[PDB]
Structure 1
Amino acid sequence: WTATSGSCKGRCFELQEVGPPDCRCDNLCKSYSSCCHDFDELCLKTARGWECTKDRCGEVRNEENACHCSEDCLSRGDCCTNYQVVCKGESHWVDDDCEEIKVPECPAGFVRPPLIIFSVDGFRASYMKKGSKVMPNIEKLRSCGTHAPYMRPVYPTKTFPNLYTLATGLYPESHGIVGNSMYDPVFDASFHLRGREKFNHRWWGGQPLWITATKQGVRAGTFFWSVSIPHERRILTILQWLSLPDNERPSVYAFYSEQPDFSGHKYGPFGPEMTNPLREIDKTVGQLMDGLKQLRLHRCVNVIFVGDHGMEDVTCDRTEFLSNYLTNVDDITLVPGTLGRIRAKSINNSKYDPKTIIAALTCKKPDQHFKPYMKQHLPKRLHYANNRRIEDIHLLVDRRWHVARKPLDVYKKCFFQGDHGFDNKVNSMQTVFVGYGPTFKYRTKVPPFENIELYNVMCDLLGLKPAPNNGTHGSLNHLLRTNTFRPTMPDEVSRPNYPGIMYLQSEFDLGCTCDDKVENKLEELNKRLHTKGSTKERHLLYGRPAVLYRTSYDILYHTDFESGYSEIFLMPLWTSYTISKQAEVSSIPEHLTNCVRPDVRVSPGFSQNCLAYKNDKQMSYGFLFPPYLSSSPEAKYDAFLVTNMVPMYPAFKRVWAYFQRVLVKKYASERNGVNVISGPIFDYNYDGLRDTEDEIKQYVEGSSIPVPTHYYSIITSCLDFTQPADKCDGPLSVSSFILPHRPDNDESCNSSEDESKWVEELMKMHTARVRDIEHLTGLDFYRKTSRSYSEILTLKTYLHTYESE
């Protein structure tokens, strides 16, 4: 019940919320159907429209007007945004040359530059260049302030997940808004765009910017706007709030436009109908900037122009139907569209089996436009598994396509030419970032970055301490003139042992053999130096990674590579090696095919054994430093050490061997040497975080050898590729992957073909940030470089997307 008989008199767009049954007058009262009776009349005036004209200048104040052109309007803070232009011979903000804002220029009583977030729905990244002719205001923001060529959204590239990621710095698996539509099995409740369940606070996790602000004593405008409130009124309300007394005035604000998303769904991302809504958005931006100018805040306020996701060409005819795949289609519930999520229709149905669903959805048609996944097999970069609201079964839909359950869902629900939601590395899904103001840099282009990073910056812009989030605080310091956050490297928790020769051959009973008894002060002194670390500066280029948890491990040195070997997991945590442009690939010689060698630096009790691989009919082994890249026939023996061995399914070895034999050398050729760090990942609970010892769900049969869920590699070289990777003076260039360690290649539909036709494609799908790997291993990389820490943080957040321009 709402007792709507109260009044909005002097409360229009009030900031504190009144709970039921008291009628409300805030910017969301319409969405709750709870506004006071006189809200429209008093708060939503439209008389005479939104622009001053010559004949209105100096008019007698008339309180019925939507905005004012009388002399008192400035003191009142309620002039039309073009008032001074029309009546006082002032210029529009867009017609002024831009002039660096070297220091904040704010009216007295402003404790800090205010932040205004101008969010635009479905604003595709390429609109900045392609629509630049009809967007003069936005183009000036872009060219004069700080801009990125694009900003990467989070998956799924839908509205609620991304707007709430913006606000919180969190992955949707953490903040809880994992789609526009959701079922939560613990609540037994559904979240929908349509209806009232979505206003329930239980859905919304983490701590969004407005709460972070309020709690730390910084007032916030309310971020959300009921749809029916026109854009002009949104803008006039922000402007009015900004003329409140110092004690009452908020320091952070949000505007939101439904455009250009709304039209992009109807007309496609580039439909000729799309010009108008881009023009209209620009006009709205111009209104705000003119309004700030009038208030003397245009060189005081930080403005963020930001979008939530892009828009792709999608039409009804490009739909795949689960009914052409499954016998049991009526036994499932599908969340449909640009992504698919599948659960049982009834929890009482015991003939439901994900295994059979997955298989009936796997590589069934030549042209198949979606790929099914158990959520834990989704690329780790998507960070989309650790929430009960995400269904075990997921369908990754090709750009341009939909998935539905049955044809009747599509014609009985073309009506549309655009949509979004696809994989967040897809070009058409990328979106915009522009920062403009005293705290942002001047005419500066920054590289593309992820929207999860903005919350930290918005907090920095407001002098707030961010709630714990998935951004890497400091990685966006290069966007900022001042207010930087100067982080320190985490402290190493475990220090390595450095074992020498401690065991005789006969002490080992591992069931391994190697043809190495084929036997000198010249080279023996030299090869002892190798074991002691004489080549370590070549292969360990950016210092040893730090171990950020409590564990027991050894550093092991070799001619061609260096490792940190876990006595707890019985295999390296990381293996590091450098491959120069000139390095040469060799084969594994015949007499060494099955060679595995005890490591006399490491006890039998802390070693793997070959017997367990003999007995485990499912499991084979690979090596982290590849024997194919040994610097000499003698050095090659090191690569067959039991301490370089890791468990690998035969199907995964097809992948790994092709990476080691062909691709590493290729990257070394193309990039002028590369430094490689490889190792295992254990994430059995799919939380994006390293598993402890008591969380391992699978061992090589009979043994305590744990089976990795993933293998990673970090491939670093010189950004200035005219310098070799091992003699690089300046910035670095990195690409990484986290490959799922799977017993089959079902994910790659072309895998019966030669590795050259499908392995690199898999690795690109599984591209990762160094940061992703850090979360999964508890290691901290790049600890000793000549680069500043913020630059290193930026590098650690970089993702190599292999998407074209």
Structure 2
Amino acid sequence: WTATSGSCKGRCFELQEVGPPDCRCDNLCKSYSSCCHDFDELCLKTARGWECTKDRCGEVRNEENACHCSEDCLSRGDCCTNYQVVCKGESHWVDDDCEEIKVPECPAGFVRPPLIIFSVDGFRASYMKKGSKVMPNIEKLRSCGTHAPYMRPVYPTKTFPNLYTLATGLYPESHGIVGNSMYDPVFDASFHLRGREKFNHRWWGGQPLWITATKQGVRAGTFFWSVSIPHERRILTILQWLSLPDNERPSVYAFYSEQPDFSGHKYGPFGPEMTNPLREIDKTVGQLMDGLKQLRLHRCVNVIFVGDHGMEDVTCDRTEFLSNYLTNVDDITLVPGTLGRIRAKSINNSKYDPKTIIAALTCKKPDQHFKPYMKQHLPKRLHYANNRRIEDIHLLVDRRWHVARKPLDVYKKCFFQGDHGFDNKVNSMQTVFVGYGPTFKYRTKVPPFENIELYNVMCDLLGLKPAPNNGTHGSLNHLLRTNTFRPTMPDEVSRPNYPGIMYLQSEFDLGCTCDDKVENKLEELNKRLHTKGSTKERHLLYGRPAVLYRTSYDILYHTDFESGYSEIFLMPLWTSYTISKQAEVSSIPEHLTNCVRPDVRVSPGFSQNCLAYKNDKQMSYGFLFPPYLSSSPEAKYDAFLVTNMVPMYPAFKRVWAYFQRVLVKKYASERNGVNVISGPIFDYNYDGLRDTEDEIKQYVEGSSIPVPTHYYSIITSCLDFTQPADKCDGPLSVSSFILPHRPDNDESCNSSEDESKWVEELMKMHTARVRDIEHLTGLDFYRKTSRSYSEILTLKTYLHTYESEI
């Protein structure tokens, strides 16, 4: 109920929300159907339009007008945005030369530069170049301020998950808005686009920027706008708020535009009809900048121009139907479209079987345009599993396609030419970022980055302490002239042991064998040196990784590689080695095929054993440092140490062996040497975070050897590839992956073919940031470089996407 009989007199676009059943006058009252009876009359005036004309200049003030061109309007803060241009001979902001804003130039009483977030729905990254001719205001913001060539949204690349990620710094799995449509099985409630459940606070997790600001004594404009409020009025409302007295004035504001998303759905990302929406958004930006200029704030306010996701070509005819795969289509519920989410129609149906559903959806048609996954098997870079609102069964849909349950859903529910939602590494899904103002840099281009990073920056811009979030604070310091956040490296928690030779061979009863009993003063002293770390500078290029949790581990040195061996997990947490451009690949000699060697530095009790693998019919083993890349026949024996061995399904060994035998050398050749750090990951509860020992669900049969869920590698080289990886003077270049450790290669439909046809493709799909690996291992990399720490943080957030040029 709402007692709409109250009035909005002097309350238009009030900032505090008034509780029911009292009628509201804030920018969201329309969507709640709760506005006072006179809200339209008083607060949504439209008379005489949005622009001053010559004849209106110096007019007598008429409070009925949408905006004013009277002499008192600047004092009232309610002039039309083009007032000084039409009436006072001033220029539009866009026509002014761009001039560096070296310091804030703010009117008296302004305690800090305000922040205005200008958010545009569906603004695809390539619009910035492709539409530059019809967007002069945006092009000026872009060229004069700080811009990225694109900004990566979160998955799924839908509106609500991305807007709320921008506001919180959180992945959707953490903030809880995991789709535009959701079912929460604990609430037994559905969240829908059209409805009033979606406004229940229980759906929205984390802490959005306006709350962060308010808790820390910084006032915030109301971020959401009812669709019926015209853009011109949103802009006028923001400008009016900016004219409030110091103690009442907010420091952070948001504008939202439903365009170009709205038209992009109808006409496709580059339909001829898309030009007009782009022009209109630019016009709105112009109104804001003109308005700021009138208020003498155009060199005071920081403006962020940011989108939520892009837009792809998608038509009705490119739809896959689950009814063409499944017999029991009426036993399931599908969230359809540019992603698929599947769960049982009824919880009382004991014949529903996820395993049989997945199988029926796996590699069934040659040109199949979606791929099914149990959510824990989705690429870890998506961070899309740790939430009960995410259905166990997920469909990753190919770009340009849809999935639906049955054909009748498509024609009885073509009406559209564009859509979005796909994998967030897809080029068409990329969106935009521009920062302009005293706190941003001048005419500066920065590399692409992820939208989860922005919350920290916005907190920096406002002098706020960010709530805990998924950004890496400091990784975007290079966007800022000032207000940088200067983080310190995490303190190492566990210090390593450095064992020497402490065990005789006969003390081991591991069921392992090796033909290594064939054998100086030249090379016996030499190999002693190698075991003490004499080659460590070459193979450990950026310092030992720091272990950020309490554990027991040993640093083990070898000629060709160095490792941090966990006595708890019975295997390395990391193995580090450098492969020069000149390195040669060798084979594993016939007589060494099944060779495994006890490590006399490590107790039998803290070693794996070969008998466990012999007995486990499903599990084999691999090596972290590849025997193929040994520097010499003698050094090769080190690669067969029991302390370099890890459990691997035969199916996975196909992948791993090709990576180690073929791809590492290829990368060294292409990048002028590479440094590789490889290791296991245990994430059985799919939270993106390292498992403790008691969370491990699978062991090698009969043993305490834990089975990794994933294997990672971090591959680093010199950004300037004219310098070898091991002699790099400047910035670094990295690519990483987190490969699922799976007992089949069902994920790869072409796996029956030679590895050269499918393995690298698999790895690219599982590309990762060093930061993702950090979360999953409790390790901290790049501790010892000549680079600034903020630059290293940027490097750790880098994702190698393998997409073509934008």
Deviations 1:357-400 (A, max 9, x none): 00000000000000000000000000000000000000000000
Q: Shift of residue 120 of structure 1?
A: 0.1
Deviations 1:24-80 (A, max 9, x none): 000000000000000000000000000000000000000000000000000000000
SS in 2 for 1:355: helix
Q: Shift of residue 497 of structure 1?
A: 0.2
Partner of 2:785: 785
Q: Shift of residue 647 of structure 1?
A: 0.1
Q: Shift of residue 159 of structure 1?
A: 0.2
Query: Where in structure 2 are there 5+ consecutive unaligned residues?
Result: none
Partner Cα separation in structure 2 for residue 165 and residue 55 of structure 1: 47
Pair 1:653 & 2:653 matched:
yes
Q: Shift of residue 532 of structure 1?
A: 0.2
SS in 1 for 2:346: coil
Partner Cα separation in structure 1 for residue 798 and residue 804 of structure 2: 16
Q: Shift of residue 142 of structure 1?
A: 0.0
Pair 1:92 & 2:82 matched:
no
Deviations 1:101-158 (A, max 9, x none): 0000000000000000000000000000000000000000000000000000000000
Deviations 1:519-574 (A, max 9, x none): 11110000000000000000000000000000000000000000000000000000
Partner Cα separation in structure 2 for residue 426 and residue 599 of structure 1: 46
Deviations 1:427-471 (A, max 9, x none): 000000000000000000000000000000000000000000000
SS in 1 for 2:457: helix
Partner of 2:634: 634
Partner Cα separation in structure 1 for residue 169 and residue 747 of structure 2: 31
Deviations 1:250-292 (A, max 9, x none): 0000000000000000000000000000000000000000000
Deviations 1:217-275 (A, max 9, x none): 00000000000000000000000000000000000000000000000000000000000
> Counterparts of 1:431-510 in structure 2 under 5 Å?
431-510=431-510
Pair 1:406 & 2:403 matched:
no
SS in 2 for 1:678: strand
Partner Cα separation in structure 2 for residue 90 and residue 121 of structure 1: 32
TM-score, length-scaled by structure 1: 1.00
Partner Cα separation in structure 2 for residue 599 and residue 245 of structure 1: 74
Partner Cα separation in structure 2 for residue 49 and residue 396 of structure 1: 47
Partner Cα separation in structure 1 for residue 192 and residue 170 of structure 2: 21
Deviations 1:575-622 (A, max 9, x none): 000000000000000000000000000000000000000000000000
Partner Cα separation in structure 2 for residue 677 and residue 664 of structure 1: 11
> Counterparts of 1:324-343 in structure 2 under 5 Å?
324-343=324-343
Partner Cα separation in structure 2 for residue 16 and residue 645 of structure 1: 62
Q: Shift of residue 743 of structure 1?
A: 0.0
Deviations 1:324-378 (A, max 9, x none): 0000000000000000000000000000100000000000000000000000000
Partner of 1:310: 310
- Give aligned pairs, total: 805
Partner Cα separation in structure 1 for residue 796 and residue 520 of structure 2: 45
Partner Cα separation in structure 2 for residue 480 and residue 157 of structure 1: 27
Partner Cα separation in structure 2 for residue 195 and residue 19 of structure 1: 20
Deviations 1:181-225 (A, max 9, x none): 000000000000101001100000000000000000000000000
Deviations 1:484-520 (A, max 9, x none): 0000000000000000000000000000000000111
Q: Shift of residue 475 of structure 1?
A: 0.1
Partner Cα separation in structure 1 for residue 206 and residue 326 of structure 2: 38
Partner Cα separation in structure 1 for residue 30 and residue 774 of structure 2: 46
Partner Cα separation in structure 1 for residue 319 and residue 308 of structure 2: 24
Partner Cα separation in structure 1 for residue 73 and residue 791 of structure 2: 48
Partner Cα separation in structure 2 for residue 3 and residue 534 of structure 1: 81
SS in 1 for 2:677: strand
Partner Cα separation in structure 2 for residue 503 and residue 203 of structure 1: 58
Partner of 1:46: 46
Partner Cα separation in structure 1 for residue 314 and residue 134 of structure 2: 25
Partner Cα separation in structure 2 for residue 40 and residue 363 of structure 1: 56
Identity %: 100
Partner Cα separation in structure 2 for residue 199 and residue 505 of structure 1: 68
SS in 2 for 1:133: helix
Q: Shift of residue 98 of structure 1?
A: 0.3
SS in 1 for 2:633: coil
Partner Cα separation in structure 1 for residue 773 and residue 145 of structure 2: 33
Partner Cα separation in structure 2 for residue 600 and residue 801 of structure 1: 42
Partner Cα separation in structure 2 for residue 779 and residue 598 of structure 1: 26
List structure 1 segments (4+ residues) > 6 angstroms apart after TM superposition.
Answer: none
Partner Cα separation in structure 2 for residue 127 and residue 17 of structure 1: 37
Partner Cα separation in structure 1 for residue 703 and residue 256 of structure 2: 58
Partner Cα separation in structure 2 for residue 13 and residue 571 of structure 1: 62
Partner Cα separation in structure 2 for residue 520 and residue 76 of structure 1: 94
Deviations 1:304-323 (A, max 9, x none): 00000000000000000000
Partner of 1:187: 187
Partner Cα separation in structure 1 for residue 653 and residue 443 of structure 2: 49
SS in 2 for 1:717: strand
SS in 1 for 2:756: helix
Query: Where in structure 1 are there 5+ consecutive unaligned residues?
Result: none
Partner Cα separation in structure 1 for residue 449 and residue 426 of structure 2: 14
Q: Shift of residue 746 of structure 1?
A: 0.1
Partner Cα separation in structure 2 for residue 676 and residue 799 of structure 1: 16
SS in 1 for 2:576: strand
Partner Cα separation in structure 2 for residue 361 and residue 644 of structure 1: 38
Deviations 1:613-639 (A, max 9, x none): 000000000000000000000000000
Partner Cα separation in structure 1 for residue 680 and residue 33 of structure 2: 55
Partner Cα separation in structure 2 for residue 9 and residue 385 of structure 1: 49
Deviations 1:159-187 (A, max 9, x none): 00000000000000000000000000000
SS in 2 for 1:634: helix
Q: Shift of residue 477 of structure 1?
A: 0.1
RMSD of aligned Cα (Å): 0.2
SS in 2 for 1:738: strand
Deviations 1:719-744 (A, max 9, x none): 00000000000000000000000000
SS in 2 for 1:676: strand
Partner of 1:670: 670
SS in 2 for 1:691: coil
Partner of 2:388: 388
Q: Shift of residue 717 of structure 1?
A: 0.1
Partner Cα separation in structure 2 for residue 306 and residue 767 of structure 1: 25
SS in 1 for 2:675: strand
SS in 2 for 1:305: strand
Partner Cα separation in structure 2 for residue 235 and residue 628 of structure 1: 64
SS in 1 for 2:133: coil
Partner Cα separation in structure 2 for residue 19 and residue 744 of structure 1: 57
Partner Cα separation in structure 2 for residue 73 and residue 104 of structure 1: 25
Partner Cα separation in structure 2 for residue 389 and residue 503 of structure 1: 52
Partner Cα separation in structure 1 for residue 10 and residue 20 of structure 2: 19
Partner Cα separation in structure 2 for residue 310 and residue 216 of structure 1: 34
TM-score, length-scaled by structure 2: 1.00
SS in 2 for 1:52: coil
Partner Cα separation in structure 1 for residue 804 and residue 798 of structure 2: 16
Deviations 1:639-674 (A, max 9, x none): 000000000000000000000000000000000000
Partner Cα separation in structure 1 for residue 301 and residue 205 of structure 2: 29
